[PDB]
């Protein structure tokens, strides 16, 4: 049930500073009171991160990995689409969050031109449901499914890092209270490892999923969501582990 929207416009995009955001734990090794230098796919410090304010969600490139950030409380952003051609010719990855759990699902999705999570009232079991047939017309030959606790939860900035390296799709995340909406915050906050998924697919493009609900007064009227997208680069960082094992500082060795 793909919903063709008329008068679709490009989403407004400014360019903001990343400061020292986007750092994650590169391994699952506990280190206490050390200075550890690692060379990995990191978001460079003070880089141009694109800030995206009826608007389209752009199918952005994936490059070597994607830093994603969002400051919202409306729960419009529900997940992401990953793949190369985003049709039923090659495989694709879909991450969908709702109020109870997260579904991560690799199939041969035939995605809609405008994919969105449709929130609609269901009269038979008497509550608002969410339809995944609004994002894809059909999913076939589906090789991976994974249901876990949702990671789009609590003013609070949500940060994610997505990598697709040597057969594994790695997601890192962090949720932090912030007191400003125009920019990314200063300070420093390392992203803890969230999931390592044995996917093994080709990913060159991605697209954010937004939740659109019916007005009940086209028919889907919901507010636009703003998110920050930056790109990782192969880069050497020096991370500072304090006595409890937390990355409390880092220096970018090419800055």
């Amino acid at each position, epitope marked *: *049930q793909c919903v063709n929207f008329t008068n679709r416009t490009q989403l407004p995009s400014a360019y903001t500073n990343s400061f020292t955001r986007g750092v994650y734990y590169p391994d699952k090794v506990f280190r206490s009171s050390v200075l550890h230098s690692t060379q990995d796919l990191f978001l460079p410090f003070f880089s141009n991160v694109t800030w995206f304010h009826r608007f389209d969600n752009p199918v952005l490139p994936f490059n070597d990995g994607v830093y994603f950030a969002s400051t919202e409380k409306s729960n419009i952003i529900r997940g992401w689409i990953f793949g190369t051609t985003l049709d039923s010719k090659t495989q694709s990855l879909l991450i969908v969050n709702n109020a109870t759990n997260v579904v991560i699902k690799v199939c041969e999705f035939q995605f809609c031109n405008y994919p969105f999570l449709g*929130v*609609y*009232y*269901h*009269k*038979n079991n*008497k509550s*608002w449901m969410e339809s995944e047939f609004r994002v894809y017309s059909s999913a076939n030959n589906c090789t991976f499914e994974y249901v876990s606790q949702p990671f789009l939860m609590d003013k609070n900035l949500s940060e994610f890092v997505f990598k697709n390296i040597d057969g594994y799709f790695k997601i890192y995340s962090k949720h932090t209270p912030i007191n400003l909406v125009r920019d990314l915050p200063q300070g420093f906050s390392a992203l803890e490892p969230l999931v390592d998924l044995p996917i093994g697919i080709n990913i060159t493009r991605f697209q954010t999923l937004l939740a659109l*609900h*019916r*007005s*009940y*007064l*086209s*028919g889907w009227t919901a507010g636009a969501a703003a998110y920050y997208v930056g790109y990782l680069q192969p880069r050497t960082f020096l991370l500072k582990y304090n006595e409890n094992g937390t990355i409390t500082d880092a220096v970018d060795c090419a800055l």
Partner: antibody
Amino acid sequence: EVQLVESGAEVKKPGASVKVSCKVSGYTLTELSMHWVRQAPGKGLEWMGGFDPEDGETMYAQKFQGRVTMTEDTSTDTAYMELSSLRSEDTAVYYCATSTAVAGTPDLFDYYYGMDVWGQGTTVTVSS
Amino acid sequence: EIVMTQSPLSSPVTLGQPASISCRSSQSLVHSDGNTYLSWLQQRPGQPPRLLIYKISNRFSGVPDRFSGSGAGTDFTLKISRVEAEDVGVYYCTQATQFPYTFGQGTKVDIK
């Protein structure tokens, strides 16, 4: 916006089944309280029966009970209504109407009772 | 069963003169939620009826602004401000509060 299409007009020997269909588009059938209204020529239209959005599912008229059966196919988004034991008075036009089950957003929604979007009517004709 | 009486049974009116259509209910149409679910429908010859006004005075999506509704309790009025050629046909008042849903007898309005 909800758009409705109907089935063909039909004739029969009396004492058999009816299957009048009503396919919705734009809004899927689970978002819509669905009602069926009979209009006779030279008479005002009267309500046969339809969905109740809360404290039950379907409600019927008192004079049509034991005859009218309404069932909904979610896969095709098609509402079907049947009625057996055709009398000669029953020859009429059968309007299919619908409304949104609720009014509002997921935040602050309230139940809506109405008769909003009416499809065209199948012409049911009992004859020789 | 709630019966709707509708007055007058017919109304001949020329072009531009406003007209009023009365609807009376044997039972008070206030619901438990607070909204009194009354609707005014218009039917053209050869055409299925379409919704003009829902909930006394709220105008449906796409209806012109020369239609207005008023009234409360058991007494309701539909006012047409400027009669044009597109308004010929039958008008019905209906409720949606107590099952079964019922309709008025309908009034006929013409040009001349």
